[PDB]
Subunit: 401 residues, 4 copies
């Protein structure tokens, strides 16, 4: 069984809701990132075995967002391409599946990622109209809210599951806003210092003049502890989750190229990192934010590594309440202190500041981890995120000098 | 690496467009079939590693149709479940990924299938109105037609890709209606003899009188014949050869396999029905999507010491008579078999023209139909494959576990 | 000032909701009725001064349903035609305006009526989306329910105003259901004895074409027990049901009105003379009471009393509403319930026949006129309540 | 018969499309103008006989825009109120009907105007959906474009009917753009000199509250060469552009009309007298010529000629439309184009000021009345073209 190497890694900068990326369909945005990876590695696209594309909001795009990403990037028709939907983890699950395909000898060279345009998601008139609607109010559902953000069993916003974690673990409003403010500060330092320059592929928004988008635009440079504390609850009366301590609604795409040992040698691709192990876990949908805890457990149990071996960590910031609850549980289970976790986690900022384009985030945070691993020269890094419906995914990565 | 066994296989009967299954959401429909598999095999759901569910039309269902299938089937929260969209091949790609996971040692016991309620698909107001729509008509797109049936590169219906194959490969209208009629006759024969009784899990639809039990494929057309088929008019192209009579229908349905490693079979005392020998995923020009089974079958066989001539039964999805005849013509040339040899063993209980084509589940559906006919006939090798919107195909090579 | 004469009167049969008239747009439906009136009177349409058309649910028809009625009936471009909306009174208010125009010498020959296709009314995405709709659900309003049936000041269905009348005036569920059953019986009797044959113009729905000529809403399979077992239609513990309220319906109705110079110059025998008109207002919360001030206003222009009426048409929007009106009218005008009952809605009413909102005001006038001619009575009164809290009324006098 | 006097006249400033008036519903906008009239005249609202309100885009407003105008202006329930739809003429036709009602002795005091929120008009899913829609795309029609701007017989935009007039009369692109520019200059002149101050009632938009009292549509950054470089807006190779056509606008406008008895009884001073009215019809394909039969029918009721008119308002639906009307009026009435243009639309017209469809026919009458008063002239004429091929006209006499 061949080791699995990451030989390329690029992401878009992340757009704000109705922001710079909002004109781009998800297939078109994703294709620009894959094309960037193709032009840099110079691999003949005909040698790719498959393209696997995380995508949640697929209504209105015509057949297969995933295949659109491949064809519009210049990958030939003979290379199959498709899409996967495990809500928030969709951009990491594509990688996990590519990992399995390479391990099982079913593939040697795979593009795996995710792409999401929450801006472009439309509104749904239910199919029950096909048989008729005699009278009264006709309600069209927001595709983004229902299909990416609404639990299918309790009909609650994901923000309610964040309140559930806050209430169950006693994570206070002030602790959530401290976490959120820190993530903003870390993101702004990373952006302004050029930290993201290597990992970001420029995206051109065709226009009256083409616009070039290359700098994350969601970080809030005009907030502070007092402003955060004065925000109103966003999801439930007298709740603690606000728009300031929750992640945003965003557009974005991100992809890896994964290669077997045979491919690395045959096509002279030099690995950035190795994927040591994967994990996918489930929890109660009502506290879906805790999904990283079984996911991380399953990934480590496939290795001789422990959480203490990780030197960098990316845990996606769906909600401050959710990440703090995850951190709290990770400490008890793995015998690390919260200060040890926090000092190495989301070191360049997280989704509260950078944004959460759902189908792409699981790949986004893996790209960010990879490039910071290389900069620091550390050996192991962990990436993981919670998933709507009560799941998580996780990747353990090892540096390849 | 472990062998990959099919230890369970069940499908719904296929519902007509706006027919018996139309009130059921795709996650509810799929869950009923997975729950049947769970009750028959008596496996503790907590020992399943993952549920992988093909599904194309996911709009308006709330988060993840895959997870809905698993949860509402009684599978614990700790078992992850999700969905895949490779259009028509979605119910077969899910098995192919389960096959990969087991070979890689990432999984031991997987439920993999697909579910699709074409009837319940809605209509899409585009997201550009979020920024405003100052004046003019506003068009809502049919979610079914656009997202399941419309090519994303040429903005043409799947039926137009059928015309392109009918033209390029010389498939006449008469040959298409012959294929279509024979498909009807074989399906009716299979339905009426009880041939599908083993493979179909009954589905309960809640109804005001009392609950409806649906267990009999309702799309086969018992009133058509050669002259009625010849009198139909072109459905997609002026002067074309493709009609509603020689094309598949719009349909609802679900279909699932349980896949097991060798450890799982021993640890859980599961009885393999068949073994999955190899898989194939191929690509072709979107303009001739129908030709997708050809590279996919080639890739599957290139992983084995088997040739197409080793197959005793074949299931090739009937997206369109023109598409299936075009595949047949090319398989014959490449693999050195006659058309007669193929047709005497392909879709022997009828195909999608008669039985229906619930897009995200057909890939799994035709595999369940293959498996049960292999058991009844006692043959060793069966092949299943189908084309895929956007120019792709998938294939499975199966071997009997007698 | 000229007297005002009704020289022609025709209505469509009334269709059920999504029923036989459902394919017809209101402009088209109204045009067939006006063209019937043109064919029978044989008046040159170029001699018509105006066409005035009641119509409530005008969304989605393109410019001016009233002008479509005239143009598609064969009335030349030079004859102006337009629409008026006073909700349920629209088909009578058009006649009342025609009466004004003739009295004032502004016109000599007018076609006035109304037309409504409740079946064809669609659903409304609100105009606020022009500026954008960032997120959350988007509700399209039912055009028919909102714009024909929903009060603009209290956001209640017209059914709630019927409940308000039942409460304030002590009108019981059983009284409502008795009134409703009687209306069904009289309507069925009238239909089946051919009493509406004279007034009804046949309508052709292109399809083979369908000829519609018989009111299809009356419920031939109901009775006191079934009506009593229905559940309230508009509020828990209420008395208004689908069975003692009118329905949702499609239909059109028209009259031709003429001066004295027109009657002479074109030799048209008046059916009746319009003696006086009335338009009244009440609280929108009890809109059904609207006929009470309208009837009072019409009579105060004459030396006539309510006791001089030999036939009455009071539209049956709801049994609660109609019984409430009857109670107040007996009081004000010194007549008994039994006296009103025996001469009011003698051929059935809207509970059985239906309520095509923009046309009913003309519809009940056409039914009154033809029963006046069969009975040879001198005076007939027509009136109906209006959404928003209004009523309209007409006093008619037979022409020997 | 009683004379008919205008005893009050007020209008909103006209809003741009999605501009300052866009948040106001048409009933609310109209009520604010009627309330201004009520507060200025200090008449007891209970003495009004009815309120008649032009309004075209009625969808999604709930029951009766006319009634909403009255109720929300503070007019009591007993005073009936309704709406009329003759497209572009609706705000003048309401007055014409008030004129008939007073003349006929059916009323003594009437509020008549129009109101339109083109910005607030929604989008229409068609009622055919009620019976089901098995598959394929679903189109929602723009309520504004279809029901106010689209011909019901040729399915063409009103801008196409302007092309037909320009082609049939040889009105050149350059002649149109000069008319348009002149209109902008006269409008800007009048706005900035305070000429409209008397006639405009301020409107409060609840967004701190906004006070809107200045016409915002006049284009102060256009000139001859910028107009010459605009693309055709309606047909390939055509002459009509966005710069020589009216705009999409919001606004309301009302008059109070009084009998001789009412003037005496309620101590009201007439501003002007309505001498005569006219309503005409023309071919829908050249609907913009509608003012020609309307004007002709109005003068033919009097001993006056077009030559007696000292001020004229003719609504500028399209420069092509208005030049064709002027060309035809000159031939029929024996006046020169120079004579007409020196006294027509002296404070600008709809190209610059905007065209709130249901209100414009009242708006141009309000603008005429106040300019009549400022100049002290005796006779003025207002007229406008109407979708579907009609016109309306009022002849006014100063009451000094």
């Amino acid at each position: 069984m061949s080791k699995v190497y990451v030989v390329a890694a690029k992401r878009s900068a992340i757009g704000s809701f109705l922001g710079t990326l909002s004109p781009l369909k998800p297939g078109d945005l994703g294709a620009q990132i894959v094309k960037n990876i193709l032009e840099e590695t110079k691999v003949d696209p005909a040698n790719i075995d498959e393209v696997i594309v995380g995508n949640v909001l697929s209504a209105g795009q015509a057949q297969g967002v995933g295949r659109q990403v491949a064809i519009r990037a210049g990958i030939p028709y003979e290379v199959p391409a498709y899409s996967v939907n495990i809500i928030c983890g969709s951009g990491m699950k594509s990688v996990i599946t590519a990992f399995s395909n390479i391990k099982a000898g079913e593939a040697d060279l795979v593009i795996a990622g995710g792409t999401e345009s929450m801006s472009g998601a439309g509104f749904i008139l239910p199919g029950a109209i096909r048989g008729g609607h005699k009278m009264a109010d006709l309600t069209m559902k927001d595709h983004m809210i229902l299909d990416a953000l609404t639990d299918a069993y309790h009909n609650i916003h994901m923000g309610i599951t964040a309140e559930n974690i806050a209430e169950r673990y006693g994570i206070t409003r002030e602790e959530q806003d401290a976490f959120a403010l820190d993530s903003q500060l870390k993101a702004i330092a990373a952006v302004d210092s050029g930290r993201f320059k290597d990992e970001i592929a420029p995206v051109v928004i065709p226009n009256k003049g083409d616009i070039i988008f290359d700098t994350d635009e969601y970080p809030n440079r005009k907030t502070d502890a007092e402003k955060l504390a004065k925000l109103k609850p966003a999801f439930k009366k007298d709740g603690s989750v606000t728009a300031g301590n929750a992640s945003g609604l965003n557009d974005g795409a991100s992809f890896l190229m994964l290669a077997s040992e045979e491919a690395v040698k045959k096509y002279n691709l030099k690995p950035l990192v190795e994927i040591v192990a994967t994990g996918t876990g489930g929890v109660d949908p009502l506290v879906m934010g805790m999904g990283p805890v079984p996911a991380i457990r399953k990934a480590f149990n496939k290795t001789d590594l422990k959480l203490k071996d990780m030197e960098l960590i990316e845990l996606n910031e769906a909600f401050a309440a959710q990440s703090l609850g995850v951190i709290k549980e990770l400490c008890k289970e793995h015998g690390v202190t919260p200060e040890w976790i926090k000092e190495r986690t989301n070191v360049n900022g997280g989704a509260i500041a950078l944004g959460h384009p759902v189908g792409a985030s699981g790949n986004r945070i893996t790209v960010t981890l990879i490039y910071e691993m290389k900069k620091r020269g550390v050996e192991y890094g962990l990436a993981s995120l919670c998933i709507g419906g009560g799941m998580g995914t996780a990747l353990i990565l090892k540096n390849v000098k």
